Ligand binder design. Structure first.
Ligand SMILES: Nc1ncnc2c1ncn2[C@@H]1O[C@H](COP(=O)(O)OP(=O)(O)OP(=O)(O)O)[C@@H](O)[C@H]1O
Ligand SMILES: Nc1ncnc2c1ncn2[C@@H]1O[C@H](COP(=O)(O)OP(=O)(O)O)[C@@H](O)[C@H]1O
Ligand SMILES: [Mg+2]
Ligand SMILES: [Mg+2]
Lengths: 294, 50, 41, 238
């Protein structure tokens, strides 16, 4: 047994140091395991939520002021607006005016420390996050694609048929491009969509939102990576295909929202102007007229 | 013991990450989150039971 | 805490079975060597 | 001679043995001038930019450099940021030259951004650093491209993440003033057609080929349809 001490004292000390290093990895996993979670429960009862709680698409915004964290500056200050169902709302302003946080406010991705967003008579703070975020579609400015087929990127849960996917691709000007690929809807999108262009990746994300077929679409500078020629026909076919649906279009180019029903001009997180573009362009001193003229 | 802890810790980590807010994902670098699945999980699955 | 996550994930029954079985196996080996020492005399 | 890059009959493929993504590429980029590549989505613009750089496999044709390509200041369409600071990303392995650094900061209008962040001009950027807005990533990449003393600048959609004022100030103070005074070759892929009057040379692309290559006076007679189409998009293009 003394020879075993001579062989195993070193092995015991080595395994103790190793076990300390392994418990470091367990410690890092537990430290990541104690991170806070979003409140997915929701105060409103699931029976009180109808089967299609965006029944028509009415949006009321009452004294909304949002921020991203506690002890941080509110990126929106006293936002108050009404959106009748079926109305098209163009949102314009300079970069940094809180108009993407406005789009994120409908999905509760920002800290709404005061104010309410009532959609069809239901406050969205009372609702579960999956319930809120499943009945609304958003198109971010930056495309996010995943590895897999085109069918997997448009419909990962396989809840829609091939005709719906082809309508979504045809609206997003990708019928000919996807049909030219030999797989078709089974054509492989690489990690981050590197086998497609930036505009084609963004059109894939637009078609990804067109599959869902909700009542409220929020297009947050979707056509920034798209050329003007195909942007105009894409805007026209989105307006015709979603004529009965409330669309909140955030304009990378202001001339795209000249045909909108109402235009929300944001200045430094405050709605300076919220009116029809025909009356808004009639005023010479209006900021929206300076956006269109320059 | 190694199989049980290796299953349960990855299940808990994967379920707790997807419920964390986007403020956490923007603040924390993705390497710090991903290395728990890559290296620390590899230690717990393989190196720790040995 | 964070260092004790492995013990809580293992559970009391599995961890105590591991410790008890290892201790009993090594004391059985000690008993075998002691009985061999008594036998050789 | 008087040109920077030239391609004669260039067939280039992304895939090793697939259909050529570029066909019959014939470009004559002038040196010290602004060349603008314009076209629709997925028509070969970034592919042409990377076919001159040798990043894409060539099937046929010839590529000539009269600058043996040498360095080319490149701002990719997806902005690439190192794990270092704002200043190290803009400088990008170059001597500091604070007088030029202030001009590059003001041309990209990055001065209000470095008046925020916990350590302005020294905050770590990218992975393991603070997350930026997409416009800020775009402007730091463009500031890296504008800062260097490279004869050739390649810009691939620098105005995608920016609004009207930032793009106009970057076009005027950065491209038309900072780059022109150095007599620098600028090749600018853009979807903003309002800057076509500021272009010395225009390369129009269509389905991975050169549709028409010339000045705006050339497009007024050679391609009447595309000229009028451009005029319809932006509401006599002199
Ligand atoms: N890295 C790549 N690998 C394979 N195919 C690619 C790659 N990049 C582009 N392609 C394909 O080659 C064609 C040309 O794309 P390209 O990169 O030239 O786009 P682009 O004209 O710059 O796009 P946009 O203006 O929409 O950003 C497209 O049909 C695209 O699918
Ligand atoms: N993830 C974030 N965390 C903290 N603050 C943010 C975040 N995203 C944006 N902001 C803040 O919001 C302001 C810009 O609002 P934003 O909606 O991004 O404007 P725009 O829509 O014009 O890009 C910035 O001053 C920035 O500080
Ligand atoms: Mg934005
Ligand atoms: Mg490109």
């Amino acid at each position: 047994y003394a020879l075993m001490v001579s062989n195993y004292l070193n092995w015991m000390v080595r395994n103790l140091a190793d076990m300390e290093i392994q418990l470091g990895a367990v410690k890092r996993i537990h430290a990541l395991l104690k991170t806070e979670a979003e409140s997915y429960e929701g105060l409103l009862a699931p029976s009180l939520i109808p089967k299609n709680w965006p029944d028509q698409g009415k949006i009321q915004i009452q004294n909304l002021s949002v921020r991203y964290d506690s002890s941080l500056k509110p990126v929106l200050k006293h936002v108050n607006a009404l959106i009748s169902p079926g109305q098209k709302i163009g949102i314009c302003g300079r970069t940094g005016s809180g108009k993407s946080s406005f789009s994120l406010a409908f999905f509760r991705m920002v800290d709404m420390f005061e104010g309410r967003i009532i959609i069809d008579g239901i406050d969205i703070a009372k609702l579960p996050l999956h319930t809120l975020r499943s009945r609304l579609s958003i198109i971010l400015q930056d495309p996010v694609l995943f590895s897999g087929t085109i069918r997997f990127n448009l419909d990962p849960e396989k809840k829609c048929s091939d005709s719906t996917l082809w309508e979504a691709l045809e609206i997003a000007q990708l019928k000919l491009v996807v049909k030219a690929l030999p797989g078709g809807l089974d054509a492989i999108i690489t990690e981050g969509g590197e086998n497609f262009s930036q505009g084609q990746r963004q059109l894939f994300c637009l078609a990804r939102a067109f599959v869902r077929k909700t009542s409220i679409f929020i297009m947050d500078e979707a056509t920034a990576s798209i050329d003007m020629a195909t942007e105009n026909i894409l805007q026209k076919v989105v307006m015709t295909a979603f004529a009965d649906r409330t669309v909140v279009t955030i304009a990378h180019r202001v001339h795209t929202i000249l045909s909108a029903d109402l235009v929300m001009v944001l200045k430094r997180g405050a709605i300076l102007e919220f009116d029809k573009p025909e009356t808004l362009l009639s005023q010479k001193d209006s900021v929206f007229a300076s956006f269109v003229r320059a | 013991t190694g199989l049980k802890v290796a299953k349960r810790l990855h299940r808990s980590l994967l379920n707790r990450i997807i419920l964390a807010p986007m403020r956490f994902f923007e603040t924390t670098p993705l390497g710090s989150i991903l290395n728990r699945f890559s290296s620390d999980c590899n230690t717990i699955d393989q190196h720790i039971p040995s | 805490r964070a260092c004790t996550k492995y013990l809580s994930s293992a559970g009391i029954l599995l961890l105590s079975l591991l410790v008890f079985s290892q201790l009993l196996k090594h004391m059985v080996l000690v008993a075998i060597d002691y009985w061999l020492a008594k036998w050789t005399d | 001679d008087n040109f920077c890059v030239q391609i004669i009959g260039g067939f280039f493929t992304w895939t090793p043995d697939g259909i050529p993504t570029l066909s019959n590429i014939t470009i004559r980029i002038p040196r010290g001038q602004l060349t603008m590549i314009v076209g629709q989505v997925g028509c070969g613009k970034s592919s042409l930019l990377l076919a001159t750089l040798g990043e894409m496999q060539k099937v046929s044709g010839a590529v000539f450099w009269n600058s043996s390509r040498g360095p080319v200041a490149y701002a990719s369409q997806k902005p690439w940021l190192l794990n270092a600071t704002v200043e190290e990303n803009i400088t990008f392995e170059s001597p500091f030259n604070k007088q030029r650094y202030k001009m590059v900061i003001e041309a990209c209008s990055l001065q209000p951004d470095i008046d925020i962040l916990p350590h302005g001009d020294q905050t770590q950027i990218g992975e393991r650093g603070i997350n930026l807005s997409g416009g800020q990533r775009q402007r730091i990449s463009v500031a890296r491209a504008l800062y260097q003393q490279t004869n050739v600048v390649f810009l691939d959609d620098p105005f995608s993440a920016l609004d009207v004022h930032l793009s106009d100030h970057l076009m005027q103070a950065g491209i038309l003033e900072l780059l022109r005074d150095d007599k620098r070759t600028v090749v600018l892929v853009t979807h903003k057609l309002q800057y076509l009057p500021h272009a010395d040379w225009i390369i129009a692309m269509k389905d991975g080929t050169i549709q028409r290559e010339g000045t705006l006076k050339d497009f007024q007679r050679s391609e009447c349809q595309l000229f009028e189409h451009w005029k319809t998009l932006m509401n006599e293009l002199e």
